[PDB]
């Protein structure tokens, strides 16, 4: 019964950037590409969505790792999975 729009997904992804103490509110909004300050190998590829593992966290399969480098490419196909915006 509750609908959703696309202005909420832009904030929550952006908020958990600020919720992490490793990342300042001085990085770019949609595309810092993770490598800008992403480190190192492990724990900068799966830990970066380990906060959304609790929040959104619909089991997030093995393909979701290397697509998630582009931080806008995360925002792309969450709308495809959960039957979202128009």
Give the residue numbers marked as catalytic. Answer: 41
Compute the distance between CA of residue 43 and CA of residue 56 in angstroms, rounded to an integer.
18
Which value, to the nearest 10 degrees, does the dihedral of the CA atoms of residues 4, 76, 32, 68 take? 110
CB of 20 to another protein, least distance (A): 5
Residue 12 backbone dihedrals phi, psi, to 5 degrees? -65, -40
CB 70 within 8 A of CB 33: yes
21 touches another protein by CB under 8 A: yes
36 touches another protein by CB under 8 A: no
2 touches another protein by CB under 8 A: yes
Interface positions with another protein (CB under 8 A): 1-3, 11, 15-16, 18-23, 25, 40-43, 45-46, 50-51, 53-63, 65-67, 69-70, 73, 76-77, 79-80, 82-83, 85-86
């Amino acid at each position: 019964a509750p609908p959703l729009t696309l202005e909420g997904i832009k904030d929550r992804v952006l908020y958990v950037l600020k919720l992490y103490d490793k990342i300042d509110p001085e990085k770019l909004s949609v595309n810092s590409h993770f490598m800008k300050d992403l480190g190192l190998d492990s724990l900068d590829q799966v830990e970066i969505i380990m906060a959304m593992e609790d929040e959104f966290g619909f089991e997030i399969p093995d393909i979701d790792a290397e697509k998630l480098m582009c931080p806008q490419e995360i925002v792309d196909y969450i709308a495809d999975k959960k039957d979202v915006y128009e």
